[PDB]
Amino acid sequence: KVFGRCELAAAMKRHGLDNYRGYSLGNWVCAAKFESNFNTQATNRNTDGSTDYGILQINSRWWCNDGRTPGSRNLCNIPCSALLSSDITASVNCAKKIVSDGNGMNAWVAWRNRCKGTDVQAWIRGCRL
Numbered sequence: 001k002v003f004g005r006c007e008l009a010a011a012m013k014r015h016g017l018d019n020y021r022g023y024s025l026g027n028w029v030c031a032a033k034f035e036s037n038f039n040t041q042a043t044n045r046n047t048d049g050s051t052d053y054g055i056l057q058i059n060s061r062w063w064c065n066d067g068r069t070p071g072s073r074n075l076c077n078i079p080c081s082a083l084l085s086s087d088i089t090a091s092v093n094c095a096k097k098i099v100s101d102g103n104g105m106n107a108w109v110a111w112r113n114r115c116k117g118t119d120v121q122a123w124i125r126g127c128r129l
C-alpha cells in the first residue's frame with residue numbers, strides 16, 4: 001500500500017516510533033519517503049545479492065529471511081515478505097532493532113544522505129497527529 005505522508009506519520013507514531021531511540025517522527029517519515037516513497041511493497045536488490053524490503057527497505061543480510069541471501073542473518077526473526085504488508089507493524093518493530101544496533105539511523109544510508117541534519121520537521125507539518 002502507498003501511504004499518504006500524514007497517514008504514515010500517524011501509523012509510525014501510533015506504533016511508538018515517535019522519538020524512539022531519539023529520532024522524532026519527522027526523522028522516520030523522512031526516511032520512509034526517500035527509502036520506499038511510502039510504498040509498503042517496494043523492493044530493491046543490492047549488489048551483494050541481498051534485497052531491501054518494505055516501507056523502510058529493511059535489508060535481508062541481517063534482519064529478515066528471504067531465502068536468497070547466502071550467509072545472511074535473520075535478526076528480527078521474520079520472513080522478509082512480512083515487511084511488504086499494508087500493516088507496517090513488522091517493519092516498525094524491526095526498525096526498532098536496526099536503529100538500536102549501534103549506528104542509530106545511519107543504518108538507512110538514505111536517511112543520512114537525505115534527512116540527517118535537515119529540517120525533518122516539515123515531513124509531519126500539518127498532520128493532525
Ligand SMILES: CCCCCCCCCCCCOS(=O)(=O)O
Pocket residue numbers: 060061062064065066067068069070071072073074075076077
Ligand atoms: C540463503 C538464504 C538467506 C535469506 C535471507 C536471511 C537469512 C535468514 C537465516 C536465519 C539466520 C537466523 O537468524 S537469527 O538471528 O534470527 O537466529
